[PDB]
């Protein structure tokens, strides 16, 4: 009935706003279709390391981006005030509706 998307580069953190949000539900109203892991899209950026020349040098950086799904089935108005007002985790992207 309502699912919230989570992404953040940090992983030892995202599931702790997940397992957090999850908890702040299965306590209150509940249902919650568990937290789904979901494809970690990881960009790579490979660049030349020497200011001048030396094309075989190069550093090879990446940016992992993790997701979680949530899905809450029964929307209680308490459960619905349980995400609201109890949320935090600044570097975590959360998407409400779809």
């Amino acid at each position: 009935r309502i699912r919230i998307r989570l992404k953040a580069f940090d992983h030892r953190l995202i599931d702790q706003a997940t397992a957090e949000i999850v908890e702040t539900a299965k306590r209150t109203g509940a249902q919650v279709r568990g937290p789904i892991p979901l494809p970690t899209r990881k960009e790579r950026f490979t660049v030349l390391i020497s200011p001048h020349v030396n094309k075989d040098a190069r550093d090879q950086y990446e940016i992992r981006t993790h997701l979680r799904l949530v899905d809450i089935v029964e929307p209680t108005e308490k459960t619905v005030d349980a995400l609201m007002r109890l949320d935090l985790a600044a570097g975590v992207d959360v998407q409400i509706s779809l």
Binding site: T46, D56, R58, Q60
Partner: protein, 127 residues
């Protein structure tokens, strides 16, 4: 209840289901032949039924995706012996000496800045 073994090789994952019955085989909803039974390694899906007899004693329906011709046929091969699981650990000893137990861990190695491909090195001229 269904007796099963995974079996996966080089980026191919085949799931293999057994049931005492005929010697009929389905893969990806298809005849053994109709998939790759008529190609390089038709004879290898069979293999895992050697010292362990059949010809039409047990039935096996499977699916498999990822990789290619021989990697898919490799997985399945590994899933058969892994499903012969059900029929004891007395047969899965010359399934060892068959070399069929093992997980063929050979993957493809990465392209690496500075080279042409994994090991291939740019020809260099001295002068």
């Amino acid at each position: 209840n269904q007796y099963y073994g995974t079996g996966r090789r080089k980026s191919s994952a085949a799931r293999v289901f057994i049931k005492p019955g005929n010697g009929k085989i389905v893969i990806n909803q298809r005849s053994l032949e109709q998939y790759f039974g008529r190609e390089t390694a038709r004879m290898v899906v069979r293999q895992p039924l050697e010292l362990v007899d059949m010809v039409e004693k047990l039935d096996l329906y499977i699916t498999v995706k990822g990789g290619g011709i021989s990697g898919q046929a490799g997985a399945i091969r590994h899933g058969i012996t892994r499903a012969l699981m059900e029929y004891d650990e007395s047969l899965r000893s010359e399934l060892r000496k068959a070399g069929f137990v093992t997980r063929d861990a050979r993957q493809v190695e990465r392209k690496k800045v500075g080279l042409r491909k994994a090991r291939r090195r740019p020809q260099f001229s001295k002068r």
